[PDB]
Design a protein around this ligand. Structure first.
Ligand SMILES: CC(=O)N[C@H]1[C@H](O[C@H]2[C@@H](O)[C@@H](CO)O[C@@H](O[C@H]3[C@H](O)[C@@H](O)[C@H](O)O[C@@H]3CO)[C@@H]2O)O[C@H](CO)[C@@H](O[C@@H]2O[C@H](CO[C@]3(C(=O)O)C[C@H](O)[C@@H](NC(C)=O)[C@H]([C@H](O)[C@H](O)CO)O3)[C@H](O)[C@H](O)[C@H]2O)[C@@H]1O
Ligand SMILES: CC(=O)N[C@H]1[C@H](O[C@H]2[C@@H](O)[C@@H](CO)O[C@@H](O[C@H]3[C@H](O)[C@@H](O)[C@H](O)O[C@@H]3CO)[C@@H]2O)O[C@H](CO)[C@@H](O[C@@H]2O[C@H](CO[C@]3(C(=O)O)C[C@H](O)[C@@H](NC(C)=O)[C@H]([C@H](O)[C@H](O)CO)O3)[C@H](O)[C@H](O)[C@H]2O)[C@@H]1O
Ligand SMILES: *[C@@H]1O[C@H](CO)[C@@H](O)[C@H](O[C@@H]2O[C@H](CO)[C@@H](O[C@@H]3O[C@H](CO)[C@@H](O)[C@H](O)[C@@H]3O)[C@H](O)[C@H]2NC(C)=O)[C@H]1NC(C)=O
Ligand SMILES: *[C@@H]1O[C@H](CO)[C@@H](O[C@@H]2O[C@H](CO)[C@@H](O[C@@H]3O[C@H](CO)[C@@H](O)[C@H](O)[C@@H]3O)[C@H](O)[C@H]2NC(C)=O)[C@H](O)[C@H]1NC(C)=O
Ligand SMILES: *[C@@H]1O[C@H](CO)[C@@H](O[C@@H]2O[C@H](CO)[C@@H](O[C@@H]3O[C@H](CO)[C@@H](O)[C@H](O)[C@@H]3O)[C@H](O)[C@H]2NC(C)=O)[C@H](O)[C@H]1NC(C)=O
Ligand SMILES: *[C@@H]1O[C@H](CO[C@H]2O[C@@H](C)[C@@H](O)[C@@H](O)[C@@H]2O)[C@@H](O[C@@H]2O[C@H](CO)[C@@H](O)[C@H](O)[C@H]2NC(C)=O)[C@H](O)[C@H]1NC(C)=O
Ligand SMILES: *[C@@H]1O[C@H](CO)[C@@H](O[C@@H]2O[C@H](CO)[C@@H](O)[C@H](O)[C@H]2NC(C)=O)[C@H](O)[C@H]1NC(C)=O
Ligand SMILES: *[C@@H]1O[C@H](CO)[C@@H](O[C@@H]2O[C@H](CO)[C@@H](O)[C@H](O)[C@H]2NC(C)=O)[C@H](O)[C@H]1NC(C)=O
Ligand SMILES: *[C@@H]1O[C@H](CO)[C@@H](O[C@@H]2O[C@H](CO)[C@@H](O)[C@H](O)[C@H]2NC(C)=O)[C@H](O)[C@H]1NC(C)=O
Ligand SMILES: *[C@@H]1O[C@H](CO)[C@@H](O[C@@H]2O[C@H](CO)[C@@H](O)[C@H](O)[C@H]2NC(C)=O)[C@H](O)[C@H]1NC(C)=O
Ligand SMILES: *[C@@H]1O[C@H](CO)[C@@H](O[C@@H]2O[C@H](CO)[C@@H](O)[C@H](O)[C@H]2NC(C)=O)[C@H](O)[C@H]1NC(C)=O
Ligand SMILES: *[C@@H]1O[C@H](CO)[C@@H](O)[C@H](O)[C@H]1NC(C)=O
Ligand SMILES: *[C@@H]1O[C@H](CO)[C@@H](O)[C@H](O)[C@H]1NC(C)=O
Ligand SMILES: *[C@@H]1O[C@H](CO)[C@@H](O)[C@H](O)[C@H]1NC(C)=O
Ligand SMILES: *[C@@H]1O[C@H](CO)[C@@H](O)[C@H](O)[C@H]1NC(C)=O
Ligand SMILES: *[C@@H]1O[C@H](CO)[C@@H](O)[C@H](O)[C@H]1NC(C)=O
Lengths: 318, 173, 172, 320, 173, 317
């Protein structure tokens, strides 16, 4: 003669707590995690081209530290620098090292073209036992250490025009002897100088005599500088001592290349997003693994978990 | 919730309803029974999926950036590099925190809303043949067999068929 | 929408209502007709205008800033300049994307709400003289001429006048 | 009958607009409005901001006084527009930290220059070059004074100039880098020059560098430009025994809304608060997609090319 | 508001109700009276407090940062330092502006909602014994003394007790 | 007979206007302020350790300007520099002053260890009447001004290895004489040089003879430089004139330390958040007092007021 019809909704025994506007924690039937917080620990070798630096920093691969010769003309999407890397050539510094590293890292190639510089009245291919190649003394593969020829070291004045349709990166340097005796027996002049210039820019470096700490037997040092030469422009190198000459130029590219410090092993797999901790999936919008990232990555956030409600409020039957 | 249905005038949910999000329970002359409402369940699921698809798998591709860890103290430039990144992270962390809060509050209100929509939809079908007990249940004032209950659930209930009987039971003594 | 009126228990909209956002259609002994409800239309329009005025024409004035295009490669400082600006643009792009999503969801719910408010307002006027057919239409259980319909539309309908007649038709 | 029917409803349009919401990627509403400004006329309006067209001149060449930029003496601007066709035509030079000098002058918004009576005892003034012709004869930057030996002597210059005014003074000066030792000694006597410019709290010392650079306008030599701001109460001291390119005075420093922009957009008679390198844009919308580089009251730059704001209800037409 | 109760079908509020946010006024045979509803008042207050607790007293700790005032003009680095900070402040200023707008709109709708919930809750109790006058007031169609009114207010009103009397008064002139 | 039961809500005579999505100003029953816009004007000395610089900048405290001697070995969470601070020793400049200030500020200590550098063939402890300590002439307490001994100034080649397990900060400098007469009578050589190096870095500075503006009787200057030496590394100082030698190293720490410019007086109270205008409470999420802050502080915003509704819409009788 009558009937009852009740309307209702489901509930689950094991709900999930989530945050809302008015509530710090409130139970819903189900939620999904928006913060990626784990990694396999391994950098996947696809889709990006990963070059493992192994024992070499990018700068040592650039300059041509003998034990980094395997990297000649190499290219990368991501260059990985390992903490076990070491230098083993002439002791050197790079004023604004960070920038040279950055700009080479970003170019994504160590492709090097040898040019025929003619160095008149000086001895070429100087080497050191601080930089052994084979059993004998050696030097950076992309630099040419010039010294006196006989009793003289003249004013070098060489030119090299960029007639190509791309930018040329020239790496060069200056030698800082440890004593005046050393300065004069290598370069004759008591005071050297190096002036490298293009049509719109110039750099002039004076060397500084004096002792530094012993590194691989030497109190002396080399300082590295660089010069970009645009198409139509022209390089002029001018020196009366202490020049560490370039042997040619590195080709400059633009693209998606970069560099990363990580000790994560590289592995055969596919992952768009790379962190120093290893590759991570990018299905979630945020991540808590590392602020350092490369590729299509979630945005780094401080939260370790953020739950997005995927169901109604959970009101269990009781 | 804004609509006062879920965790409101409906005291609690049903763990026993495993085939849908919303539904009906009844008692009539033939016995008792339970059935999910698929249309309202699908409304809620669709909205949550749409919401979910807007949030997930939309990602920026960034390649060469600034450095974010340093082995030496340098001063002014490094201070700025660190501050830029720290500023960025805090703003993104806020975005993420607010996003989830707004989304979740809304998901609760929207699911609450659908429960209420199904209730009102049912009320409307029943016209003057039922009264509302206030707990999500209708008292139907006529014999309503299993077919009759199913006719309410699938939206084909003809109130005119039962009106004379219902009005008679409702307004008496 | 949250209120289940627009794209809900009201099956569809009216292309033929060109003089308002919400309104009435009727059939009585004197014929049929359509009329817009100006109060509810204006409620929706006012809210949307207010919303619109908060978003539009609020602009930052910026003069000397940082450089954002470069003709040479420089390294560390330029990296930072570019990263700062790129970080800024992405955060603003997110703000813009979220703003529109929230606003639009709300505009739909608010307009849905006003439709429902007008319905409930009308239901309340009619008291026991009308029943609800479930599609946004009321069946009024008494002769209700054009004046009577207009009295409902302008909010002055006196249910007591028709109650005896209506209760008689409803229950019987 | 006798009954009546009263149906409540809402409007719809035949041509709706799709918009984005929280739960929907695309959903149709009756009307929407665009929040991203994505077009420009292609022209920079000359009001309300004061626009100075650099034409053939960069700001730095206008500052230094490259002869063909003399028209810019004492000029002022809200926005200085540098054209891609600009060129230098004086002595070949470089500015270490060029960006900063450009920025700080750009921001000051004036090239107003006051000549001061520096006394240079025992040296020849007003040196010039055929690399920098003014008229038919040789010349030089209008705001710099090229000093050279007087009669086989070039003494240690020790000149001072106090700021007794109530504003900051900007001094532009430089050093000459000869191409050969022969050139160094015939101009400055001393085999090695130096320039030390100082205030009470700061100093700069530059040594010149002899050597050949690429030929520019006949010359392998170069000038390098430096600057010094002198606060009220402070005092400038210039000290040199060779190679000084001396200042002739100071530029007045202002603060305000001034800046600089690289654009090849033509300037036009109209009113627009917001300027981009692509031209002026209206600022009625909150966002824009035209250019991240902006000047004035501008919409925020975003990556999206369209964002529609719903200005009406959900559109649910009846017909098919 | 979205629910049309506050500043809607309830014409105005009561300055004379100082002991609660929502409540009842009545007239019966024993006279007139006013009483707050504590349950709905507490629902609104709890939600607002929760909202308030999420916003207030959550602050990050920052120590050494960048410099933000300068005594000299320097150019490129200082431009960048100033721009970074100005960019940060504008983004936070936007966050703050949007936060308050969303929150306040919601607070109004939520309070509007609770008023409506209390109305519907009361309507449901009264069943066929009362009709709605459309201004937030019910006409109760039976003698309802102070005890009877209090029974409605504390949720224990038994409609069956008064149904015969009410149905008689409603459907008869 | 019948009865009437009306449902309603409260209202207040004096509401508050707030902003919403659809409304620029709309009245609610009550609101709360989210932007902190006032300060007591005083920096509270708890919970953070506040060191008042008084007459001294951090750099003058570091170098050891006589009137800043009280700051030897001091530590701080926040070093407060006063605008009336002044220098009163030898006139000096620091290329990249901002960085040295920053890195010391951030380290949070002036803890200084004296080391036994051997300077053979030179006179130590040079001083000036520009830097009086007591009635006689003096100099920076942490720097050692070397000059000739008799008729000679030899090539100094001194070393000092970091055998400890922490970083050492070495502050040193070079002397710029005003005349050649001055250069030779102090250092014999017509042209000096200073080369300070570690295993991975080096700096070589040449002095420049010439006149600067008169400061405390002197046209000459000192220029300050620094060198950090990592564990395992070694410092080498090499010079044939004009060296202003270090006397030892400053210990480098990492933590929550910083520096702030303010003329606000310090007071006994507790406040987590510090601004140059004084301490402010951090109960509100935003603040409009100053973009410069230290501690647990509200976010700085451009608005001076933002009201959060804490009640319903106010609809008065
Ligand atoms: C260049 C060299 O081998 N130097 C030896 C040096 O012997 C030279 C010296 O006797 C001079 C006399 O003026 O004569 C040179 O020969 C000339 C010859 O007399 C002349 O007839 C002819 O016309 O020209 C030649 C060459 O110009 C001698 O060559 O003796 C000193 C003192 O005993 C040696 O010092 C020690 O150096 C050690 C490091 O050695 C290297 C190194 O780095 O491994 C050897 C490299 O061959 C040399 N490279 C170059 C390009 O010169 C480098 C280089 O000088 C430094 O790295 C620069 O800093 O040094 C180690 O430092 C040890 O502690 C020293 O005692 C020196 O090797
Ligand atoms: C050290 C000193 O007292 N210097 C006086 C200086 O005295 C020297 C002078 O008479 C010469 C003459 O040729 O003779 C020297 O004696 C030598 C002696 O003949 C020789 O046999 C022996 O082997 O060597 C010594 C030198 O070592 C005298 O010592 O006289 C000049 C001229 O009047 C003074 O110049 C004035 O200096 C003023 C500033 O004075 C100080 C200062 O800053 O307070 C005094 C300090 O004692 C001195 N400190 C040191 C470590 O030398 C400093 C310092 O030289 C400068 O600050 C470096 O820039 O100067 C002020 O400049 C005034 O304008 C000058 O007239 C000088 O003080
Ligand atoms: C050092 O060597 C460099 C590079 O090899 C030379 O730059 C420099 O002098 C060269 O000088 C000649 C004239 O002395 C310049 O030639 C000019 O070319 C013009 C055609 O475009 C012509 O019209 C002129 O009359 C000149 O002949 C030449 O360009 C210049 N080379 C460069 C690359 O700038 C040498 N200088 C010294 C002192 O050794
Ligand atoms: C400048 O003064 C410094 C300070 O002592 C001198 O540095 C030291 O130079 C000697 C070489 O005479 C180095 O000795 C070597 O040590 C290694 C141990 O690893 C040993 O295997 C060798 O047989 C040799 O004895 C010493 O390491 C080096 N120390 C540093 C920190 O550089 C420098 O020699 C002096 N030069 C002059 C020109 O006075
Ligand atoms: C290079 O030229 C400068 C300026 O022309 C000379 O500096 C000036 O030197 C004089 C005397 O040493 C200073 O006079 C002093 O003024 C103070 C302060 O009022 C007073 O107490 C003294 O009694 C004395 O009168 C003057 O201040 C100073 N001016 C500046 C701007 O530095 C400098 O001496 C010259 N140097 C050489 C080596 O020629
Ligand atoms: C500044 O401190 C140094 C270093 O001594 C440290 O010892 C710690 C246990 C602690 O008290 C800390 O605050 C302090 O900084 C003192 O210099 C020398 O320190 C070494 C090694 O630490 C000791 O062997 C020496 O005794 C000491 N030199 C002395 C006593 O002359 C230094 O004395 C002190 N300076 C001042 C002005 O107090
Ligand atoms: C990812 O790698 C970084 C390495 O820097 C980890 O961060 C460090 O974690 C250790 C151990 O918990 C802490 O002591 C350091 O303070 C952290 N350093 C920094 C710079 O944050 C991080 O924990 C790793 N995360 C995952 C998920 O592997
Ligand atoms: C450059 O503009 C300034 C005016 O700001 C002129 O420089 C001097 O101005 C002072 C007054 O401040 C006058 O006493 C002098 O007559 C001006 N100097 C000289 C050398 O005459 C200067 O005249 C302006 N030059 C040009 C070409 O407009
Ligand atoms: C705005 O003007 C700028 C001028 O740079 C335009 O930006 C370039 O657009 C071209 C053509 O699509 C691209 O190839 C370049 O990559 C853009 N350059 C930069 C630096 O972004 C832009 O297209 C113009 N837009 C409008 C609406 O005029
Ligand atoms: C609801 O209110 C009613 C009426 O005030 C309460 O009923 C009274 O309760 C008191 C004390 O228990 C008795 O002495 C009265 O005689 C009761 N009057 C009746 C039943 O008419 C009732 O207790 C209240 N219930 C709740 C849960 O608050
Ligand atoms: C906090 O201190 C700063 C001091 O810099 C105040 O900011 C100054 O405010 C005045 C207006 O009274 C302006 O004229 C200055 O230009 C402002 N300077 C800067 C750098 O912004 C600020 O008003 C103080 N606030 C409070 C609440 O005390
Ligand atoms: C590097 O590449 C260039 C051209 O791509 C080539 O001429 C050169 O010989 C190469 N060098 C080596 C070592 O492979
Ligand atoms: C609804 O249920 C009734 C009763 O079982 C049945 O006869 C009818 O076919 C159903 N209608 C639809 C549309 O499924
Ligand atoms: C409402 O409509 C009726 C019937 O046409 C009319 O008589 C009455 O005056 C109207 N009331 C108002 C307030 O407009
Ligand atoms: C669309 O929206 C804008 C802003 O409200 C308005 O100006 C315009 O009239 C609307 N279009 C139509 C067809 O109503
Ligand atoms: C306004 O709200 C605050 C915070 O909830 C509360 O402490 C206070 O009681 C309210 N103010 C008034 C005057 O009621």
């Amino acid at each position: 003669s009558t009937a009852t019809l009740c309307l209702g909704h489901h509930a689950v025994p094991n709900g999930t707590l989530v945050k809302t506007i008015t509530d710090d924690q409130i139970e819903v039937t189900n939620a999904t995690e928006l913060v990626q917080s784990s990694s396999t620990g391994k950098i996947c070798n696809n889709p990006h081209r990963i070059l493992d630096g192994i024992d070499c920093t990018l700068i040592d691969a650039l300059l041509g530290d003998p034990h980094c010769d395997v990297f000649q003309n190499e290219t990368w999407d991501l260059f990985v620098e390992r903490s076990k890397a070491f230098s083993n050539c002439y002791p050197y510094d790079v004023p604004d090292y960070a920038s040279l590293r950055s700009l080479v890292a970003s170019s994504g190639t160590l492709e090097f073209i040898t040019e025929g510089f003619t160095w008149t009245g000086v001895t070429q291919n100087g080497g050191s036992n601080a930089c052994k190649r084979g059993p004998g003394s050696g030097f950076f593969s992309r630099l040419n250490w010039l010294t006196k020829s006989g009793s003289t070291y003249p004013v070098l004045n060489v030119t090299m025009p960029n007639n190509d349709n791309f930018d040329k990166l020239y790496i060069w340097g200056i030698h800082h002897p440890s004593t005046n005796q050393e300065q004069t027996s290598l370069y004759v002049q008591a005071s050297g100088r190096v002036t490298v210039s293009t049509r719109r820019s110039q750099q002039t470096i004076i060397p500084n005599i004096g002792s530094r700490p012993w590194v691989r037997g030497l109190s002396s040092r080399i300082s590295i500088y660089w010069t970009i030469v645009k198409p139509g422009d022209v390089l002029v190198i001018n020196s009366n001592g202490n020049l560490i000459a370039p042997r040619g130029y590195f080709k400059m590219r633009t693209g998606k290349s970069s560099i990363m410090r990580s000790d994560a092993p590289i592995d055969t797999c596919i992952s768009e997003c790379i962190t120093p901790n290893g590759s991570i999936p990018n299905d979630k919008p945020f991540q808590n693994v590392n602020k350092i990232t490369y590729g299509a990555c979630p945005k780094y956030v401080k939260q370790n978990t953020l739950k997005l409600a995927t169901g109604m409020r959970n009101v269990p039957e009781k | 919730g804004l609509f006062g249905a879920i965790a409101g005038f409906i005291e609690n949910g049903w763990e026993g309803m495993i085939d849908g999000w919303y539904g009906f329970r009844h008692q009539n002359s033939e016995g008792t029974g339970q059935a999910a409402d698929l249309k309202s369940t699908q409304a809620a699921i669709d909205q949550i999926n749409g919401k979910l698809n807007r949030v997930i798998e939309k990602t920026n591709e960034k390649f060469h950036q600034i450095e974010k860890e340093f082995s030496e103290v340098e001063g002014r430039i490094q201070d700025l590099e660190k501050y830029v990144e720290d500023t960025k992270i805090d703003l993104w962390s806020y975005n993420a925190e607010l996003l989830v809060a707004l989304e979740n509050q809304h998901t609760i209100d929207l699911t609450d809303s659908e429960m209420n929509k199904l209730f009102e939809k049912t009320r409307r079908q029943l016209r003057e043949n039922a009264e509302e007990m206030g707990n999500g249940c209708f008292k139907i004032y006529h014999k309503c067999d299993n077919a009759c209950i199913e006719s309410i659930r699938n939206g084909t209930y003809d109130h005119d068929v039962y009106r004379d009987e219902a009005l008679n039971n409702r307004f008496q003594i």
